[PDB]
Design a protein around this ligand. Structure first.
Ligand SMILES: *[C@@H]1O[C@H](CO)[C@@H](O)[C@H](O)[C@H]1NC(C)=O
Ligand SMILES: CCNC(=O)Nc1cc(C)on1
Length: 351
């Protein structure tokens, strides 16, 4: 199990002002640290945040959090379940800011909710340094779905934070799972008048203003003010990053299809095949990646994450090969993208 620690700096809060926190399982024999960002969509105005507070309150508040959690998948400490990093120090950071880990605003007389995702990550890092992170050799910032996009938005800020705090020897890297979305043409279209109809670009643009959202500096400098929503899209923000980042993405991701208004005749067949091709195209110059041709969503904290293979190579193996490459390798590849054109043309896709 991983044990809960609420942040000692209680000014860093979840949406409703309760303290944020993290779950920790230490491994005294290891200098590797894994910090995982939970996902779970987001909200972007008073009305849809109020609805989230009624039926998704654990994603907006810590008052009902349990004292422990079980680590699964890449967060498992058993080698049977986690061939990659089973002996690492394990941290799970709950997502209670509803801001895709981008926010920097407090609850106040003018703000019904606090949006402090970017500050939550920084405060977790700061408090961990006194519990052994000061002696780390690698810090891997991982995450799934909204947490995967959160890795892309924050990995270089963690690197800069540790440099400025005086720990230049810690190597910071990122693992972004199921957070590589396309602002593509949708299969059916509606103008942005409420939550359901509002396309991701328009929703994120409004969210950034509501959250006081922040993006990586080099990406901000490219797109400039008013256009920071561009930096929430993986293929646009990744070229601006300096830390090594490994990208995991199903070619036919279920959340991508949902925001494309897809739930088979010729028109839809062509649409789905073109989505797969566009995704593959955006990964062509990503040297560390794992992209199977499946209809699914998320992978790395599922207990059977070791089952899927691309070209005969599992994800735990590809991550191990990535580790080796950061010390091309004979029979130990790091770029693994399916080329077949339809969901589950890879026989190892999840059932
Ligand atoms: C608590 O966190 C806030 C937000 O980052 C920061 O402004 C403040 O200095 C912190 N307080 C302490 C005592 O570290
Ligand atoms: C309903 C589909 N889910 C999402 O769009 N989830 C997301 C999107 C981003 C960005 O972070 N989580």
């Amino acid at each position: 199990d991983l044990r809960l620690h609420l942040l000692l700096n209680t000014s860093v809060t979840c949406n409703d002002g309760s303290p944020a926190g993290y779950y920790l399982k230490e491994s005294r024999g290891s200098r590797r640290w894994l910090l995982f960002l939970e996902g779970g969509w987001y909200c972007f105005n008073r009305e849809n945040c109020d609805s989230r507070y009624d039926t998704m309150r654990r994603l907006m508040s810590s008052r009902d959090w349990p004292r422990t959690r079980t680590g699964t998948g890449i967060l498992s400490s058993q080698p049977e379940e986690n061939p990659y990093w089973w002996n690492a120090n394990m941290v799970f950071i709950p997502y209670c800011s509803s801001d895709v880990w981008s926010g920097a605003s407090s609850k106040s007389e003018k703000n019904e909710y606090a949006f402090m995702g970017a500050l939550i990550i920084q405060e977790v890092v700061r408090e961990l340094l006194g519990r052994g992170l000061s002696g780390a050799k690698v810090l891997l910032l991982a995450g799934s779905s909204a947490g995967g996009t959160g890795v892309l938005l924050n990995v270089d800020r963690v690197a800069e934070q540790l440099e400025k705090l005086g720990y230049p020897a810690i190597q910071v890297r990122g693992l972004a799972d199921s957070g590589w979305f396309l602002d593509n043409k949708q299969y059916r279209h509606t103008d942005c008048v409420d939550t359901i109809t509002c396309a991701p670009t328009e929703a994120i643009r409004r969210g950034i203003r509501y959250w006081n959202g922040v993006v990586p500096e080099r990406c901000r400098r490219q797109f400039q003010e008013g256009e920071e929503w561009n930096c929430f899209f993986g293929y646009k923000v990744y070229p601006t990053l300096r830390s090594p980042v490994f990208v995991v993405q199903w070619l036919f991701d279920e959340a991508q299809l949902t925001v494309d208004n897809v739930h088979v005749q010729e028109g839809l067949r062509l649409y789905i095949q073109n989505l797969g091709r566009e995704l593959r195209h955006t990964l062509k110059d990503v040297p560390a990646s794992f992209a199977p041709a499946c209809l699914s969503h998320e992978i790395i904290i599922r207990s059977h994450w070791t089952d899927v293979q691309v070209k005969g190579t599992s994800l735990p193996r590809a991550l191990h090969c990535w580790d080796r490459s950061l010390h091309p390798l004979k029979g130990c590849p790091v770029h693994l993208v399916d080329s077949c054109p339809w969901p589950h043309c890879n026989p190892s896709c999840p059932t």
